[PDB]
Write a protein that binds this ligand. Sequence first.
Ligand SMILES: C[C@H]1O[C@@H](n2cnc3c(N)ncnc32)[C@H](O)[C@@H]1O
Ligand code: SF4
Lengths: 444, 749
Amino acid sequence: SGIAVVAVMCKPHRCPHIAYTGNICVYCPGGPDSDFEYSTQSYTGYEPTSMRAIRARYDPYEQARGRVEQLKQLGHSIDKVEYVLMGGTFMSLPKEYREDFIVKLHNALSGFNGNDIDEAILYSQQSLTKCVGITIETRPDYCTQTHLDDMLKYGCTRLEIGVQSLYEDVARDTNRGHTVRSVCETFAVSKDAGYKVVSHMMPDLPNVGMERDIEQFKEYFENPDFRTDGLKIYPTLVIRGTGLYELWKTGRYKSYSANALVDLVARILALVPPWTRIYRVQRDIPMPLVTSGVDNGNLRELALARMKDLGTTCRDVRTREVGVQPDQVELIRRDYYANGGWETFLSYEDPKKDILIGLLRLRKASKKYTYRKEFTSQRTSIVRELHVYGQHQGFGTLLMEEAERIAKEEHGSEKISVISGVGVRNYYGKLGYELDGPYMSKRI
Amino acid sequence: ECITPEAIFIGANKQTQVSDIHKVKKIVAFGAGKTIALWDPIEPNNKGVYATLKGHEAEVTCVRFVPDSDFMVSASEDHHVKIWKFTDYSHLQCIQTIQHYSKTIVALSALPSLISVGCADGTISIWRQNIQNDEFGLAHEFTIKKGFFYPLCLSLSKVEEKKYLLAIGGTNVNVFIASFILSDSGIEKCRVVAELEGHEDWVKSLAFRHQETPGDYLLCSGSQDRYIRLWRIRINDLIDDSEEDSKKLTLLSNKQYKFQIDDELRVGINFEALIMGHDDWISSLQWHESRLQLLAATADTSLMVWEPDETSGIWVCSLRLGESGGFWSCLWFTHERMDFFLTNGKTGSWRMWATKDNIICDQRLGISGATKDVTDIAWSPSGEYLLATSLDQTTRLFAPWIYDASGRKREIATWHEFSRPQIHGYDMICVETVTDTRFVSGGDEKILRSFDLPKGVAGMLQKFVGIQFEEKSEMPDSATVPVLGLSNKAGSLLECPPMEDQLQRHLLWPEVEKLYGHGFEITCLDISPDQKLIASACRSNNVQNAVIRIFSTENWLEIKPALPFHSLTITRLKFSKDGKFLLSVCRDRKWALWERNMEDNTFELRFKNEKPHTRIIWDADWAPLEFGNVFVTASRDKTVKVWRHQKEPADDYVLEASIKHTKAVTAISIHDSMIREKILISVGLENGEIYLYSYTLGKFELITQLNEDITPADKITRLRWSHLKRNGKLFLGVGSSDLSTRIYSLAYE
Ligand SMILES: C[C@H]1O[C@@H](n2cnc3c(N)ncnc32)[C@H](O)[C@@H]1O
Ligand code: SF4
């Protein structure tokens, strides 16, 4: 089996930082103020997801339903689907459009027909084709206390922030619109609300040279400010109508050769700690559109082969699973400090074959943060995801048995709380948990 | 009185029980936005929708006729349940509104003198009619399972004296059946007695068949696993006794449920049949009045009849028809010898089919409408059609049907939809016609579009409407959809206005030119009387972009200078009745006026003002040259002011008189000619009232207010009179925010 990934795009709109800056990001292609016909921001219209959107005319009930039943004409036999939103700055849209968007995302699985956001998720809880999560990408200045609890009502569990640089000059000179000391503060309120925080990083930006790229990513996992649970490596591509195309035209910006770039990402993956995953090493842009930058579309395996003859194994949690039988497994945990709280990473491992079975995240709720009403009347601890691959069945109930014993004793908590998605709310109701708002919690 | 409702263009909702049908008289009532529309599908004319019903402040969900009475029960998303009753023969009124349940209504069913309401927290209620008045008191409510069971559909029937059976369904894989005995005061012994397993997904629709055989009838249970499982309910002394020592290896799936209601009426429910197919989820279920067929509507735009054929026993698909989206509701009725097949899709349009003896189906003229709000209206410059655009990515063409296929004048002229020129994905804010063959439109987009009328429509506008088109060997044919881009490409013997599938793809108009210049999404536009200059303005909140841009309609380029007056965003532009002047009406509570160079097409700011009104101003319109240089201005401060060019001190305009209304006036218009030295002005305000006035030099006159039964139900967006005058009657084009587009006639000598 597995998890079905259905990607939808919202209405093509303008970012909200075009007003007070004067324009959008230097490297961003596409959008309404471009030459691509009827394309969402940061897209070209020639992508296999972005071609299903234009034929659907961005109708969320008809875009998602055509994608779901397409994947079962191939015969994947889907019953657990995780939505992901992309394109634009979805939380910058008007409030009466965003809530009606998410409602028809749920109606394509349940069959309920209505417009109340507070009632559509209740019908979606007893659905049989169920939603395990919704990924919504946004900007770091749109994760305030007003926006983070709107995502809890929508059913969102994972959110993605474009960081793309850890230097102050790069976020200024590329007209990014925020500061790097501001994104390290909104990571803290997001992880204490219970979200899986994934960030985006971009090598080969302007004015960041070859050597500055490797101390950029060494800092990203040594500093306890960031230490997130995921990355999407997006190397810089020069596109036709972008802002950096004129820098390529007048000879004031040149890119990497495709022997030093694959050497770079063979060193970046060497520093990846075992609690984070690398979703993408490059993005799906058809190479006839791109002028300079990445030549081919096979940078993933060319990076794994380049670290074969360096002796270094990429210990990535996207790489280290069954995809070879364990025959045995141990229980280990890892403890790191991330941006205000004590994160732990429980997993079942084999140190010989280097393969993972299950994993879990858990966080002590800090005191400088955590504005939520349910997490203030007493000292609580937040479990953030459970993710078991595939007897080989009781790995879920073992990770919940251990995360609860470690919360009463070592955290000293009176309540444990889950950020389970709507379709998987019934798996926790059997284990003694009860719903209180967005969370599925229990007094210890 | 003098006014007469001519045309209602309303579009249905996307719920699975928006519609029902009365049995004796044949009236289709379908929920459509906040209103309840009424339509008569059988008549020598077609007439479209004839009446709507007001009262709800959210969208209408459930509509059901109480069988064998004069009532109708309705439901919506404003937490309320309303009861209707016939007043004379084809109109209704509310007599009771339920103020309960604190949540929306998702399911509804009806019997004589008893209804049943299901709401979105797991509560199933029973309401009962008492004696001495038409009032529904509450009888009993219960809950299957508190946090886990949520209803979707309900149905109930009777057995032999007072005992009823109700069939609950929703959100799980089982079907719940309850029972209750009636009494003189209310009901009692209301409990759940059965629990029907067999399905794999949710149960979306279920209905009872009428009791043809006394003591034996059927039960259909459609579901979301694409299956349409059936049941069969028998009675006392016919129980098919079993489980005896000479047992029959009962195959525990057919386990033959059995219970008692009180003591003297006991039933037996077994499994009968099981049908695959349907290719997708099924929406609605219908039985027949006399025979033994069954109608099913699915979510992949299909509609098929199921019939038990002889010499096999099993069910087989006899009649299947239908040509994305889905069919939501469906109805059956026989009129003289044949039966009719009607259903609705995602465009808010009613498809209709006729057949003879279940062999040869053919098309039939259905009605259509919009699904979201209607924004702008533009009549033809000759005035025989109008382009009504909407907020649901569509644009319509509404025109009368006077001459038939032979050529005789029909004794009643009705209004229909002939073309649907554009389907491309934007919200379609504004539109304006330039010629009888070309028009200029624009939505929430930084550019404007320009379309040409094709020959396949020019052939049938000349035939059915009866209007002359010369020089027809030039304009191209019609394409279907923009697939390699977003602009429209280039790409007989009909006897009726077209069906829905021709309106979706075979009737779009080709685009001639796409013109640039603004950079933000368009609010409104207007064109000169001499068809030489088009002007437009876009949405902003800044002084740098509040510029009227004027384009010459020959080369479709910009005219050199800008027009930098306003600050927020301009809400109205109109040229004069000649080409001399040009006013602008903005959101910054002030207006401006611009005069023409007449040889370089340049504009200069002449006559400004800074505090005309208290609140902001919406609409403006000019007066004809027989009356003088006069324009009128409406505004948010519930007043309307008429101003005249007079120059005793200097060259400026000053107000003459005004009225104060109850609500904020949003749309005004002046008829293009005058009637016995008096001009005709019609106004419209923020919650559906339409007043029309007569004015003569500082004195208004309330002619009449339009009746509340035929008015729109939300704010008026535009008002435009027609240029043509036929049979001594005028024509007004009305567009509002209750999803409707209306046309009124007005005879006035
Ligand atoms: C919306 C996502 O797209 C990525 N993104 C934006 N522009 C480019 C480019 N030229 N090359 C690669 N990735 C890009 C951003 O880093 C952001 O994470
Ligand atoms: S990068 Fe993100 S924000 Fe900057 S422009 Fe492209 S999309 Fe908009």
